[PDB]
Design a protein around this ligand. Sequence first.
Ligand code: NAP
Length: 284
Amino acid sequence: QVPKVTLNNGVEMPILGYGVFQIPPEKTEECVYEAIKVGYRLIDTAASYMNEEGVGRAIKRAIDEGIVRREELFVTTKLWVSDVGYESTKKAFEKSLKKLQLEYIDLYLIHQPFGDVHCAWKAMEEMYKDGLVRAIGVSNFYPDRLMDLMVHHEIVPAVNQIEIHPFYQRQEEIEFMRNYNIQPEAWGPFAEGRKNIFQNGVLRSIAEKYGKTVAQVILRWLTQKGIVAIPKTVRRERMKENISIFDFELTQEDMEKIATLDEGQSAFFSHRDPEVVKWICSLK
Ligand SMILES: NC(=O)c1ccc[n+]([C@@H]2O[C@H](COP(=O)([O-])OP(=O)(O)OC[C@H]3O[C@@H](n4cnc5c(N)ncnc54)[C@H](OP(=O)(O)O)[C@@H]3O)[C@@H](O)[C@H]2O)c1
């Protein structure tokens, strides 16, 4: 029984989904298919992961085998930096759509805050209004950048996908998003395992309390905040573990303990670091 959040346009999105970053293209079909069988419906990919084609094949099988209908799934993909523009953005979307073998996409995101994101958003608003995508949003946008879009365009981004985990908890940005009706979505909910997160003593003491794992506690913590989380694992047993978090609840005390862990900065790098902007823009 996986809860759904309601986005600013009335679209419902599952609060827990399945991420496919660093799953090799040739392993992505079986992973996604297994995830769906286990009960995932929110699937997160991107043009840049090079595994849309495998995601689409998993879906096609699940649908053909009767496991799900298309409407039960929530497929997210992303516009890569090098495609950002007006027509370039439509072309990119249509390329992803093809790879996925879908008629529509549930959520399409601007992947990075660089290049002509105003033209990309305008493009995206038009595909949104044409019915090609159910919800449009952004990724890795700080509040100033979110505001800039909001004051220059009609459609408020439905989602902003950003790094959120116990060591970068980003509460001030969450309340800015809640204020302006932008659903926060957590990428790297486990910080990709950085900083011995699965062995953190505070997290284990709370996990022990409930007979759950640390991973489960982290995801329960996010979702209990009203944050969509998209953990990634290539293991069937962890798919099952990661989705099995709604049969318990953290106390206020538990939530406050977890809050003490915030380090207030990325586990990876800052998007305001000019060297980072350049490194990202030079990947493709
Ligand atoms: N918008 C963006 O700029 C951006 C950037 C990065 C990622 N993302 C999205 O966010 C998704 C989630 O983030 P992520 O892949 O970076 O990192 P993540 O989900 O925080 O953590 C990934 C790691 O956790 C391990 N793991 C999963 N479940 C576990 C469990 N219950 N116990 C112990 N270890 C566990 C995985 O190992 P195994 O796979 O081997 O189990 C994997 O190495 C991505 O796949 C992608 O869809 C978006």
